[PDB]
Structures are given as C-alpha cells and as structure tokens.
C-alpha cells in the first residue's frame, strides 16, 4: 500500500489486453478503492502484532481494508477435456445436487 498511489505503469497488467500488448499505461488509486485479499492467519498476525505491539497506531491501522477467508483454495479447475465413465462418479456428483450429469 502506497506503492499504489504513485504514478506508475508497473502495477497494471494492460499488456494482456488485445490492442495494448507492448507499451505502458500509468494509473493510480485513491484509498477508497484498495482492498487486500488474504487468508485469516496473517490477518490475525496483523490483529495482534502490528496493532497491539505498535505503541502509536492511530493513523496506521489499515485492517479496515482487509477481507480474509479460511482457505484460499476449495475449488477445482479442469485442464484436459474428458468424459464420465464411472457410476460412483455419478453418485458422488448427485450427492452435491448435480442430477443431470450422466
């Protein structure tokens, strides 16, 4: 934080756009618009070490911009397109509501 509020072209990723592969683009942010994403463990590390050991804290405590989670992976993505063959796979899928798969 406050790397973000400098005029910089290093922090976007506009090179992955269609017409903007090479060349730069500068942008900033306003602190009404930055949020961080983390897991809950170092959120708690912020909530004891950086805020309670720190004697003077009255302007610094940026925990207002923090959202966390239990785990940051619980999902699954597919690389190779494939087909269903096994009956227990059908049973396990409609165990979670996927009735329509055959």
């Amino acid at each position: 934080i406050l790397n973000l509020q400098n005029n910089s072209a290093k922090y976007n990723e506009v090179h992955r756009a269609s017409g903007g592969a090479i060349g730069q683009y500068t942008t900033v942010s306003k602190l009404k618009d930055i949020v961080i994403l983390t897991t809950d463990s170092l959120k708690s590390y912020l909530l004891d070490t950086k805020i309670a050991n720190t004697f003077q804290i009255a302007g610094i405590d940026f925990t207002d911009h923090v959202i966390s989670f239990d785990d940051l992976g619980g999902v699954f993505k597919v690389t190779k397109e494939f087909k269903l063959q096994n009956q227990d796979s059908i049973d396990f899928l409609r165990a979670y509501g996927d009735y329509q798969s055959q």
Partner: protein, 55 residues
Amino acid sequence: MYEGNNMRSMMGTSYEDSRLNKRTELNENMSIDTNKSEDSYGVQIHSLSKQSFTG
C-alpha cells in the same frame, strides 16, 4: 416500438421482465458483526445464551 399484441402468457410478460422477489443478499450480516473479533474488555464469563433452536 412495435405493439402487435403484447398479450402472451410467457414471452409476453416474461420476455421483457418479471418480479424480482428474493434478492440473495446479506441480511445474515457477515463481515460486519460477523467476522468480528472486536469485543469488549473486563470482568468476564457467561455471555453465552442458547435458544430452543427449532428454527
């Protein structure tokens, strides 16, 4: 623009809009009073009420 009839059970009164009834929203308030370790400080125990939990 074209009127025609505007009278059909579905795809009339269904193709343009319908009544949004639920909202799938945060009335069970979370990240504000939930996801909150910001409690009090002092003399302690027994702030633990449980309900009949039929609902």
